[PDB]
Structures are given as structure tokens and as C-alpha cells.
Amino acid sequence: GYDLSASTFSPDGRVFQVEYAMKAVENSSTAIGIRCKDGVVFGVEKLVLSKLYEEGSNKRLFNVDRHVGMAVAGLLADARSLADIAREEASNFRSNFGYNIPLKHLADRVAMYVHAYTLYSAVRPFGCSFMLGSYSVNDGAQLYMIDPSGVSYGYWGCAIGKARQAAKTEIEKLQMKEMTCRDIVKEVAKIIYIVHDEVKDKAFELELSWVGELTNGRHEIVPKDIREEAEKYAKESLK
Amino acid sequence: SRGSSAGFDRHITIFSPEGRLYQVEYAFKAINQGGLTSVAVRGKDCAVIVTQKKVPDKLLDSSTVTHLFKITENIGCVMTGMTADSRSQVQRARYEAANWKYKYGYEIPVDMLCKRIADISQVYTQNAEMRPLGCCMILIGIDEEQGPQVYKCDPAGYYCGFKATAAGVKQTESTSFLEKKVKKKWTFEQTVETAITCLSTVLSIDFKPSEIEVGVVTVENPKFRILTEAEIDAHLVALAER
Amino acid sequence: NQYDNDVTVWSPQGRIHQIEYAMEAVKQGSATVGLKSKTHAVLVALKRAQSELAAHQKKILHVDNHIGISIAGLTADARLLCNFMRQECLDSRFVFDRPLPVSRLVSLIGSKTQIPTQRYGRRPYGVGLLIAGYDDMGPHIFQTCPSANYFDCRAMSIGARSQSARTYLERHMSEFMECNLNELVKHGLRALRETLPAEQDLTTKNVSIGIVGKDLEFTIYDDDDVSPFLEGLEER
Amino acid sequence: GYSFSLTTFSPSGKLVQIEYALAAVAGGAPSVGIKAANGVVLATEKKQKSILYDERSVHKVEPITKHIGLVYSGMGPDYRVLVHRARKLAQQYYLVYQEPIPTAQLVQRVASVMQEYTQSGGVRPFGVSLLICGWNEGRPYLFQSDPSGAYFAWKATAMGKNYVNGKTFLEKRYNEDLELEDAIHTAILTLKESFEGQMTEDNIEVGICNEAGFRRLTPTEVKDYLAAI
Amino acid sequence: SYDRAITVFSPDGHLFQVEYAQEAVKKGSTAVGVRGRDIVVLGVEKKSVAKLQDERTVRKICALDDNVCMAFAGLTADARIVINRARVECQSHRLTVEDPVTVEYITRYIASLKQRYTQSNGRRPFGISALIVGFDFDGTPRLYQTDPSGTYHAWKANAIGRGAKSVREFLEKNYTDEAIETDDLTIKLVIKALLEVVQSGGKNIELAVMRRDQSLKILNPEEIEKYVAEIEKEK
Amino acid sequence: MEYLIGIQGPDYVLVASDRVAASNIVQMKDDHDKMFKMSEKILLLCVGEAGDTVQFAEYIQKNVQLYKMRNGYELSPTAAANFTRRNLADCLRSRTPYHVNLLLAGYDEHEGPALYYMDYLAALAKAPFAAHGYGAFLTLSILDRYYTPTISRERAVELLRKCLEELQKRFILNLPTFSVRIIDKNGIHDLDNISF
Amino acid sequence: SEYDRGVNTFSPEGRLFQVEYAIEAIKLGSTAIGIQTSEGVCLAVEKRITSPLMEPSSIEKIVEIDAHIGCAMSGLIADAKTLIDKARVETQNHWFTYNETMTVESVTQAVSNLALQFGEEDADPGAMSRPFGVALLFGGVDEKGPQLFHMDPSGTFVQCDARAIGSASEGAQSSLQEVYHKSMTLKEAIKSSLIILKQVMEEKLNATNIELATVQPGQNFHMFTKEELEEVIKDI
Amino acid sequence: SRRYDSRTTIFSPEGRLYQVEYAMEAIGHAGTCLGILANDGVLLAAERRNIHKLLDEVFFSEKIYKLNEDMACSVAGITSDANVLTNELRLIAQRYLLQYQEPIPCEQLVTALCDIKQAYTQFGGKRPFGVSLLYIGWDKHYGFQLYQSDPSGNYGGWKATCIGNNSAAAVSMLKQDYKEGEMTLKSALALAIKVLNKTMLSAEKVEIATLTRENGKTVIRVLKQKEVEQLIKKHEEEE
């Protein structure tokens, strides 16, 4: 069998271990990011597998630098390991060059780290796609996504996990190029509630964060009040 | 022989009974897996690379989707095949070029950079614990004595200089087209239009300016340059009127 | 089959069978319960004795003044992870002079235990922990799985027939926040008792209790010390 | 890195990975060597399907020192590895002894490298056979080095595609009194014996070694010799 | 460096590599030891004479120190490695304790070397068993045995290699106080025990003796043939 | 300060050494022995800085005994002396140099008697006679005056006595007794101590 | 061939194959017995003599760890040597550093931390390639009084009032349940353990094919001599 | 990686080392090489496999290697492995000369190389060396000596032996014809020719080297074709 090692090509020139890691990602619940005029907003459908867990357990949104947020989907231990890697890369960059790491360079470096785990029988590919979001006055809003193969692209809007296509289809309805973060949070909540499959999993929490000119370029959790009003708007739109 | 196989010769880079390296052949199939084609052509003055830019997802930031990369001020490259592999090999090329300049005090010749990348891929073709990289690198640059150069290396560690070449799904048809054309002139003088015509013919597309990227180096302007949309459109319109 | 022997081999379903098997290792450990109130975090554990003449294996281990752990799974992996936690707590107190916040220690556990899940010829840790702590945000109960995916819990139960304890905890969970310590420990014991076969009961010999809180360093309760809590549980 | 050998003995006592490397060599492009009285010639054919190839951009016949050069049959990138290793060994020798490396010593060191790659962990043998020519102590040398690391001194030989017939052609046609110009002539005729498809100065490469040293012939010299043939 | 786990347990608690090492020892040439009153004797079957062999170069009784010597059965190259390790350790002991080794100390060392090589990555067990004989400083004669597992015990007499089973049987029935009362009789016991299995008989027997304080003296063929005749006319 | 002497005759080698171990101002020991039996027919006489001397001599001794056990025959005197020199030279430029001065005396079946002198730098010289220590300054000239190549052992013992008596008369250090040994075809023989 | 998996592979039941097989290997070992009393612990072991030519005294399956701690072994006796040496060295290090005797529990824990230290890409150039095919009974006296600990190849260790290990451990453990009581005297425990060994041994028990040792608060680890064994066997 | 490893250093179910046995099988097909000890010297005679017409004859021997002043060897088996082993022998011999300032006795050199081969058979997971060697030498302890070693790391001293093709018949013929204690170099040479004549005849197809003592110095010479043709003529006259 040609699918036991990331050091083995298939006869068709595929690396099946990477595709299986992508399948591990595609089994996870959905996260979305949308870049707009003055920042980037993240939302994640965070499935609650037991009512015994605290509201807030298993965050899928991470701060990797003060100006850079991270949203993950897939096997959560792997994603958190990559978030620690991203944090280390950002710290080393700041220590060496003396300013905040540009998002594109951070994306490229972490993507190359992910890629390094796709060449060898000694390690397995990461089972976690993740999003990177950032804002600065000089660079504006930037949103990148990295998959288990190590590919890295910039996006206006992106979705990862099991309902990726439905989310992208909803995002396409937005004129995100002309909207502000205060407008976009409502729409993010709306699409997450729309694409959430309430029949097969009964309860989820919405986690929302953003980074943009309204936070002076700091990545932060969405204030509780904006989260509940966004949820209320989403619920009534769900009507 | 004739497709014989023994032991693990389809799983790692060991010889098959015919003396083939099946894993390298599969890396060649991986090059076509990405489904894109790139073309490069050299003339007396210019070396030009053109490739498809496919953006089906309206949500991609199309300014970040490129297969063209600056290696040094005077060396550009187009990558074909698996994207992450391509990015890693571009990073390695950039490191090797910078280190060359640091150690020797002059810019790396295109042939030497291509050779170095080919030797690294060879290392991946000879050690069993890792796979070859599935990406076929094409390099362009101006050499101070021989003028513009176009070199290509592949996952087998081969590297040859070309008058023109292609990579990816329609490599063979592009090669036939360029052979036929070069026979009509031992190189060209109007190169970007030839490259674009070749790509359009073998793809049967007739491109809009957002579907290709073009990079050039010239003896007058050795710095690697990526054409803007207006310049590509001006070439497409000048071609359309012939 | 061919996909279940190597921790580095993804299955075609996007799973890692060695991780699932390690979680079965945790599921076959003896049941333990952890829960917290607004003021206290409590751990309660069943000790197994191989035979009637065995003393019963320790399940609860001191980690630091503000943190202790109950265990389920491989004892030797549990000791290894406990020693790592002990060293990290000591290092944090040495460097920063304040107790290591529980969520940061749990993060360190997640990071340490994720590493062998990704490298050839290594294996997951075959142990699950409940971690009781007190820091500036009050009591905490965390769960660490062999997958390294850790969870912040209001309460949790792991191990054999732990589903019954989880159901009890969900049934009564609206009460825990306002319970005094005695009531909270009683709740813990009732949940744990749900895991036992109909004939067996909780006794002073097989129950161990650990408590930490605002005014109480992590303290271990053994046999003679459990009698006060056991005097006050019903028969059913 | 895997630490275990990938070449091992089969039940019949063969190192099958070496036999298969030799099969790779047999399928490589032809190469020829002729030791003349006053020198050695090495010649090999470039296939080049595509006219698109720039024939001057890469060379199969390569100098190692002022007085030693090599060619191969088989897989090009392994050849480039062995060329770089041979050059490094030759420079190390020159640094120690302050004398150009004798041909036989360079051959022995390259063969020992190939042997290492036939036994060290997690690597396959080289899929290349080398022909090494040189001039020293007033005398010509021609060596072959197999993928196994065995080496042999030849008066003349052929390798790569159709090598068996090349060896019989040279056994019938070679004599010790042959001169360098004549040896070049016979090398070209031997390649033409198994050529297929019209010989040109662009699809073969020839190198010679004599008292003046080793050098590749330029296309114009080969064109000149092909006029005679 | 190669760190693969080579020797592992199999179902029912077997270490197949150790059992196979013991199979390798059982195919080795027979070696016998008997502990006498003030003598210890080693004999080994030379199954492969080779008229063209230089006998000296293939002896299987090698001295470990002045007060300790050993015989082996199994893979001779492995034995050579173990022997030279033991010789080094004996010299280290002399260096640090300023006493010769006891036979037991060096037996334990060899056994623990073998055990480490049955439990260490990258290595296979040693395919040898050893009979180690000599005298402790106080003159007490000693006979120990090691096998590939690293187990060791002391024996009144024992055999290893091919036909060890029947030679052990013979010693069990014949090793009494009477049969080892004198040097001649202990030695003739060893020779009888080999002749129980040795094909040619007498012509191809190696024999060596150690007396209290006297250091290993090997007997030449003339002397062995002399004992053989002395035994055959008695039988 | 420590004294060693050797005198090589036709078919024997005679060596002697004082029997004192001293520390700062005391004879801690008056029957100390500085000769180490390397083999049945080889003596190494090791003197010099405290600690280094015993560690070095015992290292050499153990490796020579190992050679005998491994190979079934003995090192020649010359081979043992060159081995000693190699070890001392190798440790000479290390972090653990040995400040030892040696004589090596031996008899070889085929080469006959040999006496070797080596200094702490590990220079090796074969000599018909030699001495180490400040006492060598007072005895080497007596040996030059009275030695001959054919000197009998009884005469050699007389000559040795004359040297040691000279140390008693003229040397400032108290070396009241000396160990004396002779090596021949029959191995190493201990002779009576020379005492004053 | 048959083995095609790593030494660190979990089974679908959450056990390490190698550890389960080592435990099965323990069943091939000779029988050992421990009894804990208020007056001390006794250790008894079946010698398993295979030939009358063997010196029974050169089989040593009970060893001194330190003056206050003995150890009985069953299983692959050669594997036990590095464990016994580690225990001896640990106890002497503890004495050196702390100027006190190490507790039996601490020794057992220290030895058990060597268990599960296997795998083939992890450790220093020659670490352990496989688990130990050994079970151990540690018997000694410290400030906690008499204590008996058992350890198996999983690295799990637990205090036991009485335990059998080796080929006849089932059976013998049942009899230990039958005869054991908390107020049993040391002399009664010795008698009971020799009666049980007599029952379970395939060979006829005599003063040469067994060993017996005790440890008491009074006196150091003491191996019974031949005459004392004969004497105790006289009553039975 | 466990899947691809061949486990060259394990026991077989019968207590065998299969890689060693297969290396022995490789040697059994290589060129015949025999060694004979006599009272006044020692000789080596080897089948040349380099017998193709176009070979150039550039080295002093094909299969006979000088190891030091007092020793030489020949090889049967994998030529490159033999080059490695003979280089290692030369290094060992010179290390010993350096350390002791006397030539290495033959058996110590043989033992040291056999210990290296053994290490390659016991750990490291490499294939063993596919080489058997015959060693001829003089030392002051045992005078003229002849050894054989094989890939097991076993060795023995012999009066006469043979390795390589048809070894069994050659050793049989030596067993039957060799006169222990009564062979001279002239008669040893005659027997060597007799044996190669039956187990393979022309001088160009054989190589012979002798090791004798002259004026207290070891002399190692490869007989020239003239002498070999003469010995062959004399054998055919004698027949």
C-alpha cells in the first residue's frame, strides 16, 4: 500500500498521508474568516461535546502575536502545537528584526514548518488547517490560510471544516470589500448559524474575534455584548 | 523486465530490476497533478516566462496567487507542480543564491543556481527516508557573457539549458509547438508574444489579462520584472490584431 | 490492520488509531471523579486492589501546594507526567515566585504530550488526568487525554463505567457552585458510587479524597480521614 | 536517516541492488574509452530528443584536474555527485602531497566512495559507471569504476547501451600501436556503430588527455574529425 | 547509529532471539567442565580435525587470567569478543582492587554483558555459552556456566554444545566423591564423558587442566592418548 | 627527590632504587618499592611526581599483562619500552600529563639484556647504564669511570654498592636503603637490600 | 516475520503488547511468596533445581538491597540484575545525600521508574530495548513499619499484605487469602508460606531447594541458613 | 523505519546468521585462491577473474595485497569490500608498528580484522563484508604462517587451504597430497600448480606470490609470467 508514509508517492503522484490529514480537517466543525475594509473577523462553530465543559473550554481561536490572530480547525492538539510554533516564530522575528512580523512572512514561515512534516516517514502531516489574521495601518487587513500540505494563500474570505462549501457560498453573498468590522460581525454570526447543522449536533457556542483599526491593530476577543447582539441578529435572520 | 518490480522498489528510492527509480517517475506525475502549464522563451535580448494564473475561488486574494518568484534582483523563477513543495524549493534557492553572493562576492550565475538545486533534489532521490520534491523549477536570468539564460531542473536532479521549454500538463504539446516555431527562425526576437501565443494555442484559451502572469529580464534591464496588468493587456491586444 | 500500528499513520478516515487505543487505555482505568464549587475543587478516586489482600493502588498525587491530580490509565506514564508537572511547578515558583496558574500548567501538559503523537516509533501517553487547582480565578478541574486535547471542566469523570458518573454530574451540576465543602465532597462520592457494581459500596478502605481551595493547600485524605465524609451517604 | 543497509545479500549470494544498478548503467547512453600510445580519448553520445536543448549548457565529459577527466553512462545526477566527490578528493590529495593526484589513486578513492554508498545506511548504490582518463609518469591510464566500487584498468572498452557489441568491435579493431588521432577516429567509428540517427558535432562530446593535459574538444574540432569520417 | 529494537517479546513471554541464540550454542562443539577437589578440567570435542589445520590457532580453551580460564561452545567469533571483554575486565579488577578476580566476579561480569546485549537496541544476543573454571584466592575450586540469556549458575560438572544432554546425563550418573578423588580420576572422568559422544574418539579431543596456583596447563596429544589407553583397557 | 639506577651487563640487567617515600620533611615510609613487575622478564622503575607515578606505572603494567593474556606470549623489552614512550608522549600534550621518570629493564631471549632511559618529556634512549634523580649527578661519573661492557654481575653489584655508598657520603638526601634486583634468562631475582 | 510492529504499540484494549507479553513471561518464573506482619516481612522462593550437579547456593533469587530491605524475584532472572543494582545504588545515594535510610515505598518507586523506558528512537545510545521480564517483591522495615511491595513489568507497584508471583501465583494467592490475617505472627507467617510453597512446588520441598529471608524492626535482613531451614521444615 | 529494514543482524530460527551464509555463497563463486605453507616459505596462488583481452595490466597485482613489510594477503569475494578490508588491515598494521616499534604479528592482525567483521555481523544493521582472505606472513614468534578468515569473523591457521570456486575439491586434494613437515617451496609451488590445474591452464590466467626469508628480511614477490610458464611446463612434463 502506497499510503503509509509521507515519503511515498502514489503511482498517480499523490501523497495520500497529506490527503488523509486534510480529511481529518474536513471532519472538524466550521470556522470562517472574512476580511473587510478595516480589519478581519473570525468566527468558529465550537461544538460542545458535554454540558460538563466550561463555556470557553477548547478555544479554537488563538493569539499568536499581539497583532495576529489564529483560527483553527481539525485535530485540536496539532493546531495548538502549530499556534505555539507561530508564537515562537513571531517572538524570534521581533527579537531579531525589532518590529512586528508582517503577516505574509509569518504565514510563509509557518507554512514551511507544516510542509516540513510532509516529506518524511519520521513524522506525520499535521491534521489541522488554520487561519491567520492581521491588521496594520501600513499593510491593511490580511487573511491567510494554511492546510496540511503547507500551501499558503491570502483570502478575502475563507472557511475550513466540514461545512466549508456552504460557508463559502454564503460569504460570496457579502460585499466585504466595502463593509466595516462592526457590520461584518453580524454577518459572520449569521453565516455560522446558517451553516451549523443543528440536527446532528444539538448545541454549539459561537466564538468571535477581530483585529482591525477599531482595536488599534490588536487582536482581541469580541466583547460579550457585541457577541450576544450578533447572535440575536443571526437567530432572528434564521427565523 | 518490462515493468518488473521486486521488494520495496515502488515505495522508496531504490532501483527496480530494470534500473528505474519509480518514486522519481511518480514525482514527475505529481508535477502534472497541479494541472497548470508554464512556458519560457529566450531571445537575443530577452528571457520571458508566462504561466497560467487560475483563480476559481472569487475569495482568493489574487495578488498573492503566483507561481513567479524573485530569487535575486537578477534571477526570476516560475514553479510548476505541487505548491507547497514549490514554495520550499523557492526558499532553498533563495538561501543558496544569497549564500553564494555572501561567500564569493558576485551574483550567482543562473546555471550554477540551477545545478545546485538539481544536486539537492538528487540528494532526495538517493536517500530513502524522504521523497523527491514534486516541482519542476524554471529559472531565467541574464549572464554577463552569454546573455539571457533559461534553465530547468526536475525531481530527478537533471538540469539542462533551453532555448525554450514548458512544464506541467501540456508540456509535450508546448514543446512540439516551440520546436516547430524555432524551426521558422536559432532563437526569436519578439519573445513575449511568441510565449503567449504558444500558451494560448496549446491551451486553446485566448487569454484575458487576469489569466496569465509574465516576467522578463533584458540585457538593457537585467532586473527580474513582473508585468503589470496594463502591459500584459497591451501585449494581448497587439497579438489579437494579427 | 495496516493503519493501526504506527502513531504516524493517518487512516483513510482522518483518524489515528493509536490515539483511540490510548483513550481505551484511559477508559479501562478505575473510575475517578472531579468537581468544583465557587470556593473548592475536589477530587475523589476509587482505588483498585488486585485481590482482597492488596493495599489498593494510589490514584491521587500531590503536585504543588495549589495543584493535585487524580489518575486513570498507565501508572508509570502517570508518574512520568506527574514528575514533569512537579518539575514545571517548581521551576515556575523558582523563577517567578508565584504558583503556576493551572491553565498554563495544563497547556504545558498538552504541549508535552502532543509531541510523541507526531514522531515515528513513539507512542501517546497512556494516562488521563483530572487536575484540581486554585489560582486567581478560583478552582479548576481540567482533563487531559492521551490525544493531548485537554478540556476545562466544571466537573468530569473518566475511567471504567464513568458514563454513569458523568450522567449523575450532569443531573446535579446546577447545585455544585453553591455547595459547602462537605456537600460538594458528598456529591463527588455519590457520583463515584454510581460507577460501582450493585453489590459493592464505598468504604474507608477504597476511597481517597483530595481538596484544595482559597484557605486550604492541596491536602490528601486517606482511610482514617475519609470517615467524616462517608458518614452521610445513603444506601442506594 | 535510516541506519540500516538497503543493499543486502540474496540467498544466491548476489547483491541485487548492485545488479540492478548495473542494469541502469546498461541502459545509459553509450560511452567509449581508448588508451592510445600517447594518450586517451573519451567519447559519448548526447541523445537530445528536443532541438530545444542547449547542448553547450551541460557537459557529460568533465575535467577533474589539469590532467584527469571523466565521463559516465547511466543517471546524470549521480554522475554530478561523483564528479564533485572526485574533485574534492583530488584537491585534498594536492593539498597534502603538492603533486597532481595519480589517476589510479583518484580511481581508488572514487571507488571507495561508491562502495560506501553500497553499504552505508539508507542509501542505494550509484547508478553510474565512470570512465576516468589521465596522464602521469609519462604514461596513459584508463579506468572504469562499477556501481559496486570495483575498478579495472582497460586498454579500451565501451559501456552503456549496446556495450557488448562495442567491446567486441574494439577487440577486433584496437591495437597498442594506435595513435591518439587514430584512437579518436576509432572511438567515433565505434559510437557510429551503435548510433542510430545521424552523427553531428552537437550530439557527441569528446575529451582527450596527453602531455599538455586533459580537455574537452570544442564543437569545431569534432566537426573537423567528422569530416574525416 | 542503529537503534532498532531487535530482540522483543513474543506471545506467551518468549524471547525468540534468545531461544535462537541457544539453538546456535547447541550446534557448537561439546565442551565439558568438572570441578575436582584441587583441580578443574576442561575438555572439548574437535569435530573437525583438518589434517591441514594448525591446531594451536583454533583452541577453544582460552585463559582469562592467571586464576581463571574458560571454554565455550557456539559461534567462535562471538566467543572471542566475550573473552577479550573479560580479559579487559580482569585487568581492570587487578588495577582497582589489587587482588585477582574471583571466578564468580568474572562470571557475573560476562553474564551481565550478555544480558545487556539481549536488552539493548541494535544488537543481537551472543551465540555462546561458557564454562568458567578456576580457583578463588583461598584455593576453593569453582565451575560456573553462562548462557546467552545472561543466566549463570555454579556446577559440579556440565556440558554445552551438541550432545550436551547425554554428557550431562553421564556426569549425573558418574560424578561422585570417588570418581573425583584424584587428579587422574577426575581427568579420566572428563575423557570418558567426551568419549560418550566424540565420533573418532581420543584422536580429536582437546583437554586442559588447572591446578591450585599453577596456571592453565594444556595436555598434548601423546598425553591424551595415554589417558585414553589407560581408560580403554580398564573398560 | 627520588633515585633510580640501572647497570646492563652482557647477559643481565641490574637495577636499584631507594626505599623511601617522603612528604614535605618526613620519611612516611622507609621500605617503599618503586619497581613494578611488568612481566616475568621486565621491570619498570617509575619515579617522579606523587600520584602520576603509580597511576602511570599501573596503567602500563595492566596493558602489558593484557597483551600477554590476549596473545599467549610476552612483549619484548624493546616493544614494552616503545609502548611506554608512546603512551607518555600521547599524554604529554593532553590535559593530564604525567611527570614521571622511568627506567625499563628487561631480558629478551633473542636480543639479550636491555636497559632503557626515558624522561618525563618521553624521550627514549637505550643506554648501557643510566640513573635518575639528583643522585644521578653523583653516580653517573662513577659508572663512567668503572663500568665496562663485559662487567660480571658480582662486579656490577660491587659497582652499584660503590655508587650507593657515594650517595651516603656526599648526597644531601637521606636514602639509607635500596632495593636491588637482577633480570636474566631465568626471570627476575630479588637480591638483598643494600643498607647503611 | 510474525512481529511487525513497534515495541511501543498499544493494543485495541489499551495495553502495550510488550508489557502484556512480559507479564505472561512472569508466569514461566518460579514461585515467590511474601507475607507482611506487625513483626516483620518474610520472603520465600522456589529454587527450581534442574540437575543434582548444580550447586543450589549459586541460584540467588532473593537478594539484599540494603540492610533494611530485601528483594525476591521471579521471571527472567538475568533481566532482574540491572533492577537490583539500580535499587542498591539508589538506596546508597539516598543514604549519602540525606543521611537516613530510604523507605521501602521510595525504593520501589525508584525501581519502577525504570519500567516502560523502552522504544527505539528516543534515548541515549544503549537504553533498554524491551520491558523487564521480572516481577519483584520488596520487603523491608522503615518508620512506617513492615512493608511489602510488588512490582510488575508495567511499572505499577502497590503495597500488599500477601502476594504470590510466578507459575503457581493463582492457587497460592487463593491460599494466602484463606490463611492470612492481620494479627498473624512472623513465625506463623513463615509456617504458612512454607506450607504454601510445599503445596505448589512440583519437586518435593526440602532445605536445599528453597530460600527464606525475614526482615524485622529488631534486626537486619537475614537469610535463613540450611540448619534454620531444616529446623523450620521440621514442624510442617 | 521498521517496514523497510531487512534486519541483517538477527538469528534465524535455527540459530543461523543468514547474511553471513549468503556472503559465504557469494565467496564460493569468486575466483579460486589457495595458500600453502612450507618449511622455507609460503605462497599464494589465485585464479584471475580479470582475464578479458582488453585489460591493461597496470598494478603490481590483481588480488595480492601487501599489508606491511612482513605480510601480504589475497581476497575472494566482493572486490570493493576487499579494498576496504585491505585498507583497514594496512591501517591496523601501521598503528601497531607505531605503538610498539615492531611489525604486527600475523595473528594479531588477523584477529583485529576478524573483530571488525564480527562487529559488522552483530550490530549496526549493515550487510557483512562479502570477503574471505588468505594471509601469509612471517613473525619472530611462529615464523611462516597462513591464515583464513571469512565473513562470520571466524579464522583459523592452516598449513594449506583454498577459498573461492571449487574450494571443497582443492582442500580435499591438499588434505590428500600435502606432506606435513616435508614440503619445500619448490614442492609447495608444484602442488599449487597441480591443484589449480585440476580445479580450473596458462600463466596469464594465474597469479602466484611467494613469501620467503633472505638475510634476515622478508621478501614478497609475485612471480613473473616467465617463471609461471616454466612451472606449468614442468607440471605438464611431470604428468
UniProtKB/Swiss-Prot annotation, chain B:
GO cellular component terms given for this protein: cilium; cytoplasm; cytosol; extracellular exosome; mitochondrion; myofibril; nuclear matrix; nucleoplasm
Domain of life of the organism encoding this protein: Eukaryota
Sites of Phosphoserine modification: S16, S62, S63
Keyword Glycoprotein on entry: yes
SMART domains, per the entry: Proteasome_A_N
Cystine connections: none
Any one Gene Ontology BP term: proteasome-mediated ubiquitin-dependent protein catabolic process
Glycosylation sites: S4
Protein localization: Cytoplasm; Nucleus
CDD domains with a match to the protein in the record: proteasome_alpha_type_6 (cd03754)
Keyword Repressor appears in the UniProt entry: no
PROSITE patterns: PROTEASOME_ALPHA_1, PROTEASOME_ALPHA_2
Modification sites for Phosphotyrosine: Y158
Alphabetical list of Gene3D superfamilies matching this protein: Glutamine Phosphoribosylpyrophosphate, subunit 1, domain 1
A single MF term (Gene Ontology): endopeptidase activity
Function noted in UniProt: Component of the 20S core proteasome complex involved in the proteolytic degradation of most intracellular proteins. This complex plays numerous essential roles within the cell by associating with different regulatory particles. Associated with two 19S regulatory particles, forms the 26S proteasome and thus participates in the ATP-dependent degradation of ubiquitinated proteins.
NCBIfam families: PRK03996.1
Family to which this protein belongs: Belongs to the peptidase T1A family.
Entry protein name: Proteasome subunit alpha type-6
UniProtKB/Swiss-Prot annotation, chain C:
Keyword Ubl conjugation: yes
Superkingdom assignment: Eukaryota
Name of the protein in its database record: Proteasome subunit alpha type-1
Subcellular location: Cytoplasm; Nucleus
Subunit-level organization: The 26S proteasome consists of a 20S proteasome core and two 19S regulatory subunits. The 20S proteasome core is a barrel-shaped complex made of 28 subunits that are arranged in four stacked rings. The two outer rings are each formed by seven alpha subunits, and the two inner rings are formed by seven beta subunits. The proteolytic activity is exerted by three beta-subunits PSMB5, PSMB6 and PSMB7. Interacts with NOTCH3. Interacts with ZFAND1.
Per UniProt, location of the Glycyl lysine isopeptide (Lys-Gly) (interchain with G-Cter in ubiquitin) cross-link in this chain: K112, K205
Family, as annotated: Belongs to the peptidase T1A family.
MF annotations from Gene Ontology: lipopolysaccharide binding
Job of this protein: Component of the 20S core proteasome complex involved in the proteolytic degradation of most intracellular proteins. This complex plays numerous essential roles within the cell by associating with different regulatory particles. Associated with two 19S regulatory particles, forms the 26S proteasome and thus participates in the ATP-dependent degradation of ubiquitinated proteins.
Curated annotation (Swiss-Prot), chain F:
Induction annotation: Up-regulated in ovarian cancer cell lines.
Domain of life, per lineage: Eukaryota
Compartments (UniProt record): Cytoplasm; Nucleus
Family matches, as InterPro entries: Ntn_hydrolases_N (IPR029055), Proteasome_beta2 (IPR035206), Proteasome_bsu_CS (IPR016050), Proteasome_sua/b (IPR001353), Proteasome_suB-type (IPR023333)
GO terms for biological process, alphabetical: proteasome-mediated ubiquitin-dependent protein catabolic process
Primary location: cytoplasm
UniProt-listed SUPFAM superfamilies: N-terminal nucleophile aminohydrolases (Ntn hydrolases)
Positions of modified residues (N-acetylmethionine): M1
Protein keywords: Acetylation, Cytoplasm, Host-virus interaction, Nucleus, Proteasome
GO cellular component terms, semicolon-separated: cytoplasm; cytosol; extracellular exosome; membrane; nucleoplasm; nucleus; proteasome complex; proteasome core complex
PANTHER family, A to Z: METALLOPROTEASE TLDD, PROTEASOME SUBUNIT BETA TYPE-1
Name recorded for this polypeptide: Proteasome subunit beta type-2
Organism for this UniProt entry: Homo sapiens
Highest classification ranks of the organism: Eukaryota, Metazoa, Chordata, Craniata, Vertebrata
Curated annotation (Swiss-Prot), chain G:
Alphabetical UniProt keywords: Acetylation, Cytoplasm, Glycoprotein, Nucleus, Phosphoprotein, Proteasome
Cellular component annotations (GO), alphabetically ordered: cytoplasm; cytosol; extracellular exosome; extracellular region; ficolin-1-rich granule lumen; nucleoplasm; nucleus; proteasome complex
Induction details: Up-regulated in colon cancer cell lines. Up-regulated in fetal Down syndrome (DS) brain (at protein level). May be the target of the transcriptional activator NFE2L2.
Glycosylation sites: S193
Pfam family, one: Proteasome
Binding partners and assembly: The 26S proteasome consists of a 20S proteasome core and two 19S regulatory subunits. The 20S proteasome core is a barrel-shaped complex made of 28 subunits that are arranged in four stacked rings. The two outer rings are each formed by seven alpha subunits, and the two inner rings are formed by seven beta subunits. The proteolytic activity is exerted by three beta-subunits PSMB5, PSMB6 and PSMB7. PSMA5 interacts directly with the PSMG1-PSMG2 heterodimer which promotes 20S proteasome assembly.
Official protein name in the record: Proteasome subunit alpha type-5
